[PDB]
Design a protein around this ligand. Structure first.
Ligand SMILES: C[C@@H](C(=O)O)N(c1ccccc1)S(C)(=O)=O
Ligand SMILES: C[C@@H](C(=O)O)N(c1ccccc1)S(C)(=O)=O
Ligand SMILES: C[C@@H](C(=O)O)N(c1ccccc1)S(C)(=O)=O
Length: 358
């Protein structure tokens, strides 16, 4: 590999792994249309299985970027509009607080205080309906952002309804397959089980537990190679042959809301490049990232801005991931680990690497 890339990546990631006690890690740097891969440690400690370029990691909330692009593709297909009322796609949602809550609000966490999690007690479809029917907003729509699986997860479920496809079938056929992400999964198939890393939490091997809206909010598993291809697809949407997917990728990077110095896309979040590293590093801490914050509407949304830092953190109980890229520089990074270690450590490492290369 180019020595600059080798050195920049190793000098940043080796200490990170040591400090954070990460059992296994894979990193991709995407530099001018080419990926460079690096791996460390163990996918399975007990079985002594190393992390390889074929190891599957749980992406956790990085999955929301796939959800956002799938939703973008459904808009491009003319199947949904972000301006449509939620009730158009879920007519059983008759409670009055839903008047004025659109798919845009669901997609961007601005419905007015939908909770981070769907309650664990929600086990059935009828339970889910009751939950949303009985939910009371703290805020008028389009006024406060509160990061929420119950928000974007419902967006993903509704976005695919006109197609008649299940969320998994829509994702596979409309996103994974056209982009040749052949080792990216909502449900890991038996053929891939030998590559599926264990997550580690408090010294125990764990995989993500089933939950309502899991696929839509945090349920994708992928390899470092497929994730590098995902970054390249989001860096160069016009190279995608399928018109609706090409458009959907771009719609996910449109800037719909601003809070502080960040802009909310569909799944993706964006800041102007060059960024203040303190703002992305400190801003990534859950003390800010999961907080309720006022939003300014961007009226109308800015189309995807080339000079942006585009990124997403995400975790499950046993995994921690980060993806960031800068379209104007054709530059990106993917960091996948089988421990949920703090967001700011991820973002700090990514910025050190990308800043040294840009
Ligand atoms: C960088 C550029 C491209 O596709 O070559 N564009 C882009 C802008 C934002 C995000 C991703 C790509 S584009 C289609 O505006 O010219
Ligand atoms: C906060 C969020 C994430 O970091 O991806 N979630 C999480 C919460 C606790 C532990 C691990 C992850 S999630 C996937 O539940 O939304
Ligand atoms: C992330 C997930 C998991 O099992 O890994 N968990 C979860 C549990 C209930 C609802 C949503 C997510 S978690 C946060 O306990 O680790």
């Amino acid at each position: 590999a180019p020595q600059q890339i080798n050195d920049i990546v190793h000098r940043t990631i080796t200490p990170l792994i040591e400090q954070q006690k990460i059992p296994g890690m894979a990193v991709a740097v995407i530099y001018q249309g080419k990926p460079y891969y690096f791996t460390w440690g163990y996918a399975d400690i007990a079985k002594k299985q190393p992390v390889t370029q074929q190891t599957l990691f749980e992406l956790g909330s990085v999955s929301k970027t796939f959800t956002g692009v799938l939703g973008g593709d459904a808009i491009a297909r003319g199947e949904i509009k972000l301006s449509d009322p939620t009730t158009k796609y879920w007519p059983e949602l008759t409670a009055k607080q839903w008047n004025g809550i659109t798919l845009l609000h669901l997609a961007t966490y601005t419905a007015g205080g939908l909770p981070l999690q769907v309650p664990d007690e929600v086990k059935s479809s009828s339970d889910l309906l009751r939950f949303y029917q009985n939910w009371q907003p703290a805020w008028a729509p389009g006024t406060q952002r509160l990061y929420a699986n119950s928000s974007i997860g419902l967006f993903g479920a509704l976005a695919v309804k006109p197609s008649g496809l299940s969320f998994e079938q829509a994702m596979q056929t409309r996103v994974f397959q056209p982009l040749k992400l052949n080792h990216t999964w909502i449900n890991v198939p038996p053929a891939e089980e030998k590559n599926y890393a264990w997550g580690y939490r408090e010294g125990k091997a764990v995989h993500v537990s089933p939950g309502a809206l899991d696929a839509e909010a945090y349920g994708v598993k992928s390899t470092i190679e497929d994730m590098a291809r995902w970054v390249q697809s989001n860096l160069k949407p016009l190279d995608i042959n399928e018109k609706t997917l090409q458009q959907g990728i771009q719609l996910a990077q449109s800037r719909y809301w601003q809070t502080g110095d960040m802009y909310q896309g569909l799944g993706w979040e964006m800041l102007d490049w060059p960024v203040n590293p303190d703002s992305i590093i400190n801003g990534s801490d859950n003390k800010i990232a999961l907080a309720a914050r006022p939003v300014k509407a961007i009226t109308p949304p800015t189309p995807a801005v080339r000079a942006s830092w585009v990124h997403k953190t995400g975790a499950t109980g046993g995994f921690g991931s980060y993806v960031a890229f800068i379209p104007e520089k054709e530059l990106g990074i993917v960091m996948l680990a089988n421990k949920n270690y703090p967001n700011p450590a991820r973002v700090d490492a990514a910025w050190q690497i990308l800043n040294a290369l840009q």
